[PDB]
Amino acid sequence: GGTVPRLHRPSLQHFREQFLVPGRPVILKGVADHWPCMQKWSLEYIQEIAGCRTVPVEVGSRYTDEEWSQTLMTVNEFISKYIVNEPRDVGYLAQHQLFDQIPELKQDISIPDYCSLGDGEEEEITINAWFGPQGTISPLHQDPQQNFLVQVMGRKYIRLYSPQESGALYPHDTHLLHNTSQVDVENPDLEKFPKFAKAPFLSCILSPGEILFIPVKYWHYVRALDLSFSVSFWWS
Ligand SMILES: CNC(=N)NCCC[C@H](N)C(=O)O
Ligand SMILES: [Zn+2]
Structure with a gap:
């Protein structure tokens, strides 16, 4: 398919009518560009301010893997073990409300103004940290709220598939995992998941300073x- 459209600081109104109401993904430029975190967040800064704090860490390449597990460690431990010193395994600090835990970090980001278009309240917005090495994978899934994913460091390849295309995504039947596809997007078993081939999608390479809107x-x-x-900012 095609790329997600990029737009330089779209107005509330046009963001509302063109993307939010119809549920169309978009990359917003110029918004998160000047937030303090783009200039200062780096390994040394992360260690200095968060080094000693305990954090949940997912070990294993993908969360749908049989051998995937969850553990806890300090930030300094995570960086030395899963990022810096030739990691034996894949570690991801994922989906953690790190700003609740380290409130000094919260001044480096801002809640995007577009969040105010939803009929929910500011303080009920969930702010999650996603931090890991090159190669971490988050398998094909869907979330229950709107999402603003801001890239601070590095790049991410992302694939988006519409909720109307769900049939072709072969979601798990378990209930616990109903919001997760059974397909490995980048090397799909087309003998087992033949409908996946046809499903159209959007993709991009999200880069620092860019905000992706995931409906x-x-x-x-x-x-x-x-x-x-x-x-990531989850809101409604
Ligand atoms: C939580 N594991 C993560 N590495 N996968 C990407 C995020 C999936 C999560 N289930 C979500 O709600 O976004
Ligand atoms: Zn998600």
């Missing part, structure tokens, strides 16, 4: 291309 229930897959650090 509620829109399926998304993410693979970090470099040492990456993203911030």
Whole structure:
């Protein structure tokens, strides 16, 4: 398919009518460009301010893997073990409300103005950290709210598939995993998942300073291309 459209600081109104109401993904430029975190977040800064804090870490290349597990460690431990010193295994600090834990970090980001278009309240917006090495994969899944994914460090390759295309995504039947596809997007078993081939999609390479809008229930897959650090805002 095609690329996600990029737009330089679209107005509330036009963001609302063109993307939010109809549920169309878009990359917003010029918005997160000047937030303090783009200039200062780096390994040394992360260690200095968060080094000693305990954090959940996912070990294993993909969360749908049989051998995937979850563990806890300090930030310094995570960086030395899964990022810096030739990691034996894949470690991802994922989906963690790090700003709740380290409130000094929260001044480096801002809640995007477009969040105010939803009929929910500011403080109920969930802000998650996503930090890991090159090569981390988040398998094809859907979320229950709107999402603003801001890229601070590195790049990410992302594939988006519409919620209307769900039939072709072969979601798990378990209930726990109903929001996760059974397909490995980048090397799909087309003998087992033949409908996946036809399903149209959008893709992009999200880069630092860019905000991707992922509409509620829109399926998304993410693979970090470099040492990456993203911030997601879930809102309604
Ligand atoms: C949480 N595991 C993560 N590495 N995969 C990407 C995110 C999937 C998560 N289930 C979500 O709601 O976005
Ligand atoms: Zn997600």
